Each structure stands twice: as structure tokens, then as C-alpha cells.
């Protein structure tokens, strides 16, 4: 967990996206999803919502729509949730309401929703919606204009990790209903990683091997996780 | 494509799933697409092609696969699967309750002719009972999905995803190439044309056989000769790789 919304919006600008998606998990401990989206509107405006922020999300969102769906479930909630917030912020920054939102004081969840309720007076319910639609439009075009080198490179980055997360997640339920307490750590280990570090792929093999100790179906999964320890492990016996 | 529901259902019994999922596309041609009509044809067809308890249990494997987190069946492959499940439940109801006879004939009918048969037979089960039955069978089914052999599911998975992972990646290459800003690049247009055709070739394929690897390689080769962008390269690499390791892992397997 990071210390600030400012650090999370840094990760976003730093193309750190697996990390930035934890932003809504941060606001969870620092204060329903009705409340949630409004916290992130407050949080983003007080933390320097800009055009660059929108534009760098349009990469992330474009990655989300990829047919290979690297971001799914928990991560996909994170992504869409935040996106629901980005549009109101987009309405606010455009019609110059961003100020009534910006403050000094350290507010509480109840007090936040309080002023956002009051601020609703500055925007008729009918126009809020009209701008929301236009801001959506203006966004989705930037989603289309998203530089494909940036999108692509981002994708490997995310999916490098993400793939194993599902591959492993699936290895678990298949095993539970077919050692288990063991794998959950590999699930919880990998859960924490933002990227596959060459040091991280090392700790993986330190898992794969340790399972062998405790089924023909488990096979092709390890083969898809850490092939090399297998090739070693099998040849070791073949010389008996 | 295949010429017979018997052929398709055979594939389902054999375990050839990507092929089995091609069924509702055949049914759409054999008859000439409101989903209710399409589910109607599937029910008729499956009941004449020897719907049975084993058909259900194997289909359970397929579904269990569709629910993996790696999500091997997306989009149209997914629509196939779900549309077939909507036909499945009525058949389970008709099977348990001895209604199938009214659905069984050797007379080769038309779409309009089957939809009429379907409405005629609608009067042999009162709606309320159909819905109760329908849920009982759904219960009976989803339990079998929870119980599907982990061996059998895991095997279907590797061999569906084997093809299917390629399918989605190639679609994502395609849209990115289209969406790329390439002013100098005079080959972009002929490179897009290559990916589209690769996408098209692969769309018909249910497994990676020697032929497939070879065609894929022919496309990927031509693409390299078209002088791709930096980002395109990662895609080309994944699409036709050389997994000397995996080669060496499976031999040893």
C-alpha cells in the first residue's frame, strides 16, 4: 500500500498501471460504491487532475479493451470504477467547477459527500448529464488516438504478471476439487507484484519445485508456469 | 465446415470442442437469426441427433472450461457456448419427461417448418411446469459442472487455449496496427491486409496442426518482410515463436 493519492496518481503518470489500480483499495482504508466514486472525484481534483492524467488513462483503458483481456475481475472493477469517476472530473474541469471541490482541510467520508451534495447546486441535474455524455465522447476519442506503441508496451507489462495470476488461480480451484495451503502463498505472493522482475521469476521456481514434494493434470500448468525446473527435475531421474 | 449435426455432436462426444462450438454457425446455414429461433433449431436438432446423458456430461466439461479465470472462450466462441446451453435445458426437460417423441422425425424440414413443430408441441407442457422443470435440470447440470473431472477439464483447456490464445492476440495486433500513426510507412496498408487474412485463416481452425503452424509462419514471414514498427515485433514474436524449451519439455513428458 502507498501513502498518498499523490503517489498513486504518480504511478499513473509513470506508466506503473498495475500499481495505480490499487488506488481504489487505498481509499478503502483511508475513509458501497456510490460513496466510492465520489471519494475519487474529490481525491483526483484536490490531487491535480489534468489533461495529461486523462490522456494517460486512455492508454490504460485501451489496454482494458484488448481482446486478450489482461485486466479481469478485481482489476477490471478497479479500472471501470475509476473511469466512472474520470467523467465527472472531466465535466468539472471543463465548466470550471473544479474549485469548489479543492480544499485544505482533511475531511471525513461523510463530510466529503456532504459538500459534493451541496455543490450539485452549481450544475442543474440535466446539464451534469449532458456534459457527462460529451466528456465521455471526448474521452473515447482519446482512447482511440492512444499511441499504439505505448498501449502495446503497457500490455506486456501488465499481462506478463496478470496471465500467471489467472493461470495460477485456475490451477488452484482445479486442485481444491480434484499442497493447497502451499499454492495460496504463490497466489498471495504473485498478488502483490506489480511486475515480473527477473528476481521475481526466480522466486517462482522456488515455488514450483516445492510443490512436487506433496497428478498428470497438474502437469501442463507447471509447464506453462516454470518449464526449466521441470526439465532439470525430470532429467535428474532419467540418469538413475 | 461439417455437414451434419451428427458430425458436430460426434465431435462433442470425442472431445473436439472448438469444432463442436462451430455447430450453431452450421445450423444457421443449413436453415438459411432471432436467438429464440436459433435455440429452437438447436433443440430440434439435438433431439433428433440422439441427445443423451453423456452429451450433457461432456458438455459440462466444456462449460467448466468456460468458467476458468484464464477465460479461454471469449466473444463469439462464448456466444456459441451460451446459446447452446440455452438449448440444453429444454432438451434435459424433454428427456426427463418423455416429450422428445413429439420432436423426433426423419422428415427433413425447413426453418419455418420446425418453428411450427415447436409451437405445436408447446401445448404438451404447461409453462409453469416447464419453468420448474427447467430449473431442476439447471440445478442437475451446474452440479455436474462443479464435479467435472479435473483431469478432463485441464486437458480440454490446454488444447482449446492453445488455439484460442492465438486468436485473441491476433485480433489485438490487428486493431493496434489499424490505430497506429504511420505517415512514412507505405507498407502499413499491405501489412494490415496480411493480419486480416491471418485472422481469417485462423478463424476456421480448431487445433494447431502442422499445416497451421506452417500457414501462420507464412503470414508472419511476409509481415517481417513488410518492415513492421517496433511494437508490431513483440506480436510477431509471440504469434510464430520457436519454443525449443516447450519442445524439449513435451518430449521429456
Author numbering:
A (entry chain B): 1 to 31, 39 to 185, 196 to 231, 234 to 259
B (entry chain A): 1 to 32, 38 to 258
What text comes from the article?
Lpg0393 is a newly identified Legionella effector classified as a hypothetical protein. Through X-ray crystallographic analysis, we show that Lpg0393 contains a Vps9-like domain, which is structurally most similar to the catalytic core of human Rabex-5 that activates the endosomal Rab proteins Rab5, Rab21 and Rab22. Consistently, Lpg0393 exhibited a guanine-nucleotide exchange factor activity toward the endosomal Rabs. This work identifies the first example of a bacterial guanine-nucleotide exchange factor that is active towards the Rab5 sub-cluster members, implying that the activation of these Rab proteins might be advantageous for the intracellular survival of Legionella.
We subsequently prepared a construct having a deletion of the C-terminal 17 residue segment, which was predicted to have an unstructured random coil conformation. This construct, which is referred to as Lpg0393Δ17, was crystallized and its crystal structure was determined by the single wavelength anomalous dispersion method. Lpg0393Δ17 adopts an all α-helical tertiary structure containing 12 α-helices that are arranged to form two physically distinct domains. The N-terminal domain contains seven α-helices and makes roughly a 90° angle with the C-terminal domain that forms a helical bundle structure. The asymmetric unit of the crystal contained four molecules of Lpg0393Δ17 that formed two homodimer-like pairs, mainly through the association between two C-terminal domains. Probably due to fairly extensive intermolecular interactions, the conformations of the two C-terminal helices, α11 and α12, are different between the two Lpg0393Δ17 molecules involved in the dimer formation. In one molecule, α11 and α12 are parallel with each other and separated by a short two-residue loop, and in the other molecule, α11 and α12 make a ∼70° angle to form a wedge-like interface with which α12 of the first molecule interacts. In contrast with the crystallographic observation, Lpg0393Δ17 was eluted from a gel-filtration column, with a deduced molecular weight of 35 kDa, close to the calculated monomeric size of the protein (31.5 kDa), and suggesting that the physiological state of the protein is monomeric. Remarkably, the domain organization of Rabex-5 is reversed in comparison with that of Lpg0393Δ17, which comprises the N-terminal Vps9-like domain followed by the C-terminal helix bundle. Notably, as predicted by the initial bioinformatics, Asp313 and Tyr354 of Rabex-5 are conserved as Asp41 and Tyr84 in the Vps9-like domain of Lpg0393.
